[PDB]
Structures are given as structure tokens and as C-alpha cells.
Amino acid sequence: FVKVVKNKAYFKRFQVKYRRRREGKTDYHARRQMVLQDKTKFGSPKYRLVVRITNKDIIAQIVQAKIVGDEVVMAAYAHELPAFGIEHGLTNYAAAYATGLLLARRTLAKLGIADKFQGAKEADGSYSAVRTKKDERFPFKAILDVGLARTTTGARVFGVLKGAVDGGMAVPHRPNRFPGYNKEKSSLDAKVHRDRIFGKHVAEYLKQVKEEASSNPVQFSRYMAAKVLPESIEGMYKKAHAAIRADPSKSL
Amino acid sequence: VHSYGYKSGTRHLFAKKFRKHGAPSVSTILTNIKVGDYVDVVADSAVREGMPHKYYHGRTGIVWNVTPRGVGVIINKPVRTRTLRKRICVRFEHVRKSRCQEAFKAKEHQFQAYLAAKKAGKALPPLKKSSRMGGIVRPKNVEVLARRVADYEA
Amino acid sequence: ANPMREIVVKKLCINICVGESGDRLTRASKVLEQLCEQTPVLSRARLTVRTFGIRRNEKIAVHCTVRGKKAEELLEKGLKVKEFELKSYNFSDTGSFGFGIDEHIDLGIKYDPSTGIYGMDFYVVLGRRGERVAHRKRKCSRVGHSHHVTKEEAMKWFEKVHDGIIFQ
RNA sequence: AUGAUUAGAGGCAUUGGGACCUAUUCUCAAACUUUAAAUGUGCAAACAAACCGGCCUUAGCCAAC
RNA sequence: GGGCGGCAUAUCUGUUACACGACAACGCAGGUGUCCUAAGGCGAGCUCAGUGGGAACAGAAAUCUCACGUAGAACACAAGCGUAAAAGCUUGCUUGAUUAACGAUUUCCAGUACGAAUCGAGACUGCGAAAGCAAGGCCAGCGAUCCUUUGCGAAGAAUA
RNA sequence: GAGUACGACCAUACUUGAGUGAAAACACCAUAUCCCGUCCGAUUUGUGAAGUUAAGCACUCACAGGCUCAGUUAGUACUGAGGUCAGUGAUGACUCGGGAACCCUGAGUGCCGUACUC
Ligand SMILES: [Mg+2]
């Protein structure tokens, strides 16, 4: 017939991978280099900005690697943004920026380093050029760990990036993968990036859904079921950043 | 061995154990090496970068140098009539921390366990009696050791 | 049984295997843009077989994966040339099947005097939704052995949607 | 597992004038090996040293101490 | 024995070699004096060899599709090590294959030189969102004094 | 008693085939105006929330293969020291010590850590 590949000899000599490699959760080739620090820094704390965006949630958490298992310092989620005035988005780019702000406000108040290192109380799209020791008092430094997400110029793991940066945390980055960045012109556009900080790109497409589904007779069903309107999407976030930045420890 | 290069006769020596292959683990990166510590140079192929020479593979010595991805370690090599101290420098994956002084830090901290029970309190664990003394034997089972006939038919 | 187990069409593969070095093939890439209406991609050879007149890394084929709405409208286009009758060995045990047309002008394509005639392949890929778990960056796993489309399962789908004549 | 190497058992359609597949088998390897000794080989076993609680210093490290 | 033959004359992997290291023979089995502006550097995406089911012409072999596939492929080369969201393949930008204050070290060792290599610090950079990686392609591929020869020590300041 | 995100050891965790799955979450799923990337909205990126536990995941079950752990093999093979030992020799026993391996058999089939949640 056909030769069986999976002989008993196949099973006897099979070397299984790591558990979170079989499960498809960890890139250990990047895990190793993110955790790697100088040996002359004799076990100094090094923090990762672990952002993980699921189908219905944004998970942003500050994590220190240990030999016994990684030690989460103050996680922050997107499903607890309804405690702040955002009932609707929760997986868009405008809730990436809110979860990153709400992470960098809960983290500095955890340290006591808030009311210093606050930064960009009203947001722009413009690049900041983060001050770190590789480059007075230094801000709290964590590096951004996308895990396995494809870092494209406009992605939502980079909205948590400017959430954390404009929340007072010091993450090293260049603006090459912000949404309002042009590859061949090599110049940032702060108009286009600020618009999806405050969810304007939802509002020109929530408008088309309420305008091309009222002339013609499932997209944005729970928003059309709600009384929510365009022109009330953009100011909904600006007011919701006040609810985050003034009191971030609130939740559901 | 007909060639006297750097990795010669290192066929089985720089190999990896069966179903133990792969790049080094995260607890090797996080393990921080400090100057003055006994480490234990064991060359890790799957790195192939900053390996020690084949002589320094079972060996263990004192760290004298810590650079960002390197460890210097002082290892004794006997040459003719003398034991001179070789200061090699490897990558950090080719050192393990040494448990050579584990049994000495154990009875050292037992000498602050004792002297914290003698000067202040009185509670001590009892001293252990030797099994080499002459006791009485109560035989709960006896046999006869006799080399039966049927012991040969095998 | 369960509405998540509706066998749909996943993809459709419009293979042309010209064989020539690229003289006739450059009007074989144009004959398929008048079809499926997205950009064709070329294909070179693996080895060099002397009897066939083909050498390595010379563009020898044109293929297209088409999905969505034209994955449906090119079997109704494509099974008119079969009269809804294709055999039982045209089906694979992985759940999919295929068939090969002999000349494309019997579809409804106007015959240009520049581009000649071409015979094609039409290999569909049948599957159920939930096949994403085998094609993911994170959490990539396998599809279990109740959710694969079978050969006996691709029998009845061809007899309940488009057709009904296997004619073994 | 790789390299050798005898032989019987049928799988029945997987073929052509034992190929193929599955379990076993007789017999082996300086340049094969899952496993693995005996003999060896490195380091440590409190007097320039480690141990325990403040201090001074440093343009070392860390957001800070 | 010397001669012819050869290279065991500088040198690399396996074995001899006797489970640290070191170990001889015109002992065994093969390599070396080259090769590469990418076959270097890096980021991203991808999975290889092979087999099985399938699809006009189209067969054992052309190309499409699906499944299984611990590496059975590949990494310029002898061999051994090593390697799978890579070290392989494809692609994208690149020049770290430059400089590197006479830093220290390893292998051979007389602890000499050479060749090769490792761990650094300084300049300027490359790729990357970042952590990082990179001062060739790991590990063989090479050479004293003397002589020849080239590069650097721009001009413009300075009452010295 | 469980989920999710980061995990440490890296099969007692794997492979195949069945079974079951409260909540919540993960997940398939819907979609293409913007950001973005493709032969292809497949992957990927964005924006969603009608549907379903079919599949992933989780757990449970195999006179399952594997793996892990003892036991047996077995004081057997082998070996350090010894002899004006035995044997034509090949080699063998003895003496003072050390002491395996596969087959086989039995067992059970992940475990620990941080943050958030049902
Ligand atoms: Mg001259």
C-alpha cells in the first residue's frame, strides 16, 4: 500500500517543541531578544509592553520577565473602558489609544510617578522622540512587544503605542508604522493619525451605514440599535480621555 | 587527530543530547552572572558563537570579567610542571552557575541556625547516632544460603 | 445538522499550462483577465525535462485563485461545457474535485483574432467555514476529523447545488 | 535513526518479467547509535576568605532608591 | 638501506585515540592555495526533502490544488557539528567585508611569532516599530627582516 | 470549579480516534469606506457583532503507539588492583573492589508562577 510516515520510530525520536510554540502563542526567537539585557546590568528590571488584540478585546499589560514566570505589573483591558464613557468601540484604533492611555496612567500611579510625566493632555498625531537613557528625571521605560501580530503601518498595536507614549510612559519607537505616515515621502501626517485617535474614520463609515441602509430598504447593528450618532463619536473620546487621565483606577 | 584546528575531535563533544536540541532557554538569558562567582563552562552548540575551546568543557572557575554578552572566567590548565590560570572569554550561554560550593553554604547557614538556638534558646535537633555500633539483631526472617542444584541449570 | 457545516466553495483555480517559453504565454495571461478579472500570476519550471522542451526557471504556466462571487459564477459558466456530468474519479478524498475544459471560447468569451484558443483546468476546493484554524499566524492548529469535507460528502454537494449527474 | 544483512509470514490489488506495504526474524559496524560502565577528569570543603548589620564614595545599572 | 615513485615538507573534518585533554606510523577515509557586491548585513513573510489523493492536451516525470511530512532538504566547498514563525527559502532596504585609541584573551605553544578565532571599549552607520543584530561569508583557505612601493600628516590661523 | 493574557520547566504535556463542554471569555464568524497588503479581504490589515459550539481550545475515554518512572534482566555483560593462577594456545576462573544495557513487566499520562475575570 502506502508507507506510513508515523512509524513507531517516528514517535520514538520525535522532539516536541515548546508548549507555547505548539499552541501558537510565543515567538521564542523574539522572546529571547526582548528579554535579553546586558550582563553588566546585573538583573535590572526590564519591562515589556505586551499588547495582545483579540476579536473582542485589547489587552495591554506591563510585564517583567522572571525565571519562575513573567510578573505582570498592572494590566489594562478594553472591556473596562465602558467605566469611562466608551460603550461602543472596544476593538478599534480609537480604543487602542484609550487602553494605552489607561495603561500608562495606572502604571505611573502604581509607581507614584504621576503628576510628573503626564504628557500630551490633548492629543496630536505628531511624533514625540521619546527620551530614554540610551539617548533631568527619565520617564518609565518599557518596550513594546507585539508578539505575533504583523506590524503594518496603521495597525492597532501601534495605537496602544501612542496611548502609552502620550500617557507618560517612555516606549522607544520611530513613527514609521503610525497610520498617518507615508513610506515614499518619509514624512508623518499628524492630521490622518489624530483622526483615528478620536475615531473619525468610524464616523465616515457609520455615516455610510446609516445612509446606505435607509435608502436601499448587520454592520454597526448595536450602534444603530443605540441612539449614537456621527459627530458624537469624536467628542465621545475627548471627554473619555478626561475620565481616564484624571482617575484611571476605575473599572466595572 | 590528523588536523589541529580549533574544533578537532569535537564530534561527540560539541553535539547535543538526544531530543534535547534547540536554541538556549530563557532561564539562561535571565540567569545573571556576577564577577567573583564560580561558573561552569559547558560549550553549547546551537550557539556556535563565543564557544570555549574543547579543553574548557568540563571545567569550572571564577568569573573575572562581565561584558554585555560575555563572561571571562579563570580556569586552571596544567602545562608541564605548573598549573597556570587561563583567562578565557566566552559568550554567556556557555557558562552555567556552579553548584560546587552548595554543600559548604549549606553547613555554613547551619552554623547560623545553630548559634541562634544555643545563645538565645535551647531547642536543637538531636545528634545522629552511628549505625556502626553493636546492637542486638531480632531475626524477623531467616533463610539458608546453600547453592541449590537447580542454580546451575541456567 | 448544524448550519456551520454548510459546504461552501473556498477557492477556484484557473490553471493554464502553456509549456512554451513565453511567446504564446503572453497572450495566455491576457485570456484570463477577460475571465476572472484580476491580475494573473505566472509560473516557472522546477527541473529541465529534455523530451518536453522546457528548462528551469522559464515561465511555463498561468494560474489564478479566484474566490467570492466569481467562484460561484464560473462553475455555472464552467459546467455548461460538461452538461453537469463529470465522473466519480474527478473527485479527491480530501473533499475537492476538478475538471478540465478543452477550449475556452465555448464559455461565452468573444474570440479575439490576436489571442488564440486555450484549454484550461477548473479545480475547485470545497470546505466548511472554520478552515481558518489551519491558516493563522497565532494559535494555528488543525481541523478535526469530523469537519473535513470528504469524497462522499463532495458527491452530494455536487448533486444538490449545481448538478446531479456523476455518471460513474 | 543511519550503514549492512539472511529468511519465512500475507496485505490483494500496489505491480512487473520480488518488487511494493505491514509486523517479525538470522546476523553485524574503527570512521553507526537510543542507553551506558569500570578506570578517569574539573571545582568547593572558614585565618588576605566567606557570614551578619548600620556608614562614606562612584560622571556604574535601574523610572527612582 | 639509497634510488625511482610519493608527501606523511604549511594545513582542514572523521577515525586510529583506549568516555577530560594530549598521543605515532609512505596508518585509514576524504579536503586545502580557491569562491562570493552577494553567496555579506538586517527586517519581514514563508517551509524543506519526500510521499499520497486529485485536475484539458499532460505519461513515471511539465504545472495547479489539498493532505501528511523532526528535517529524511538546504546552508559555494571535504567532513563533522548546529539550525524550523530558522541559521533554510523568497523578498525588501543596505554596505559592519570601513574605522577600530599598540585593550585583554584563546587555539598551536617555548605558554614565542604567524594563521585563524573569541570577549570589549571609541567613531560613523545599516536594517528594524522595537528589543536587538551587524565590524564578512563561524570553525581550513596562508607568509619575517632587507628592499621596492602606496596611503595618511587639506590650507587657514598663531609674536609664538 | 474554571477562562483569558504573559509565562518558567519543555511529551507524565506528543500522535491518532471517539465523547462531553454551566457561566463568562477565547474562537470560528460578518465585512471592505478609510490605514494597509495581496494572483486572490485566502493569509494579512481595518471595521464590526447577525450566527454557532460544527471546528480550534478545554476536559474525559482507549489490554492505543509514544513518553515518563520504578522493577526485572542481573551481581549477568564489562571493568580497576593481584598471582612462579589454570590452560600448547585461544582464553577462562579465582581473589580484593565498582557494577551495566535493550527486551520484558508494573504504574500514570503534565506541573509550578504573575495579573485580570466568571
Ligand atoms: Mg626589490
Residue numbers in the entry:
A (entry chain O): 3 to 137, 144 to 225, 230 to 264
B (entry chain S): 2 to 155
C (entry chain D): 8 to 175
From the paper:
Here we determined the atomic resolution electron cryo-microscopy (cryo-EM) structure of the Leishmania ribosome in complex with paromomycin (PAR), a highly potent compound recently approved for treatment of the fatal visceral leishmaniasis (VL).
The nominal map resolutions for SSU and LSU were 2.7 and 2.5 Å, respectively. Notably, one PAR molecule was found to bind between H45 of the SSU and H69 of LSU, partially overlapping with the AG secondary binding pocket previously reported in bacterial ribosomes. In addition to the clustered modification pattern of h44 and h45 of SSU, H69 of the LSU that penetrates the binding pocket is extensively altered with six modifications, three of which are of eukaryotic origin. These include the eukaryote conserved Am502 of chain β (A1913 in E. coli) as well as two eukaryote conserved Ψ moieties at positions 510 and 512. Given the close proximity of these modifications to the PAR binding pocket, we hypothesize that the local modification pattern of H69 might also be a key determinant for PAR-induced activity in Leishmania.
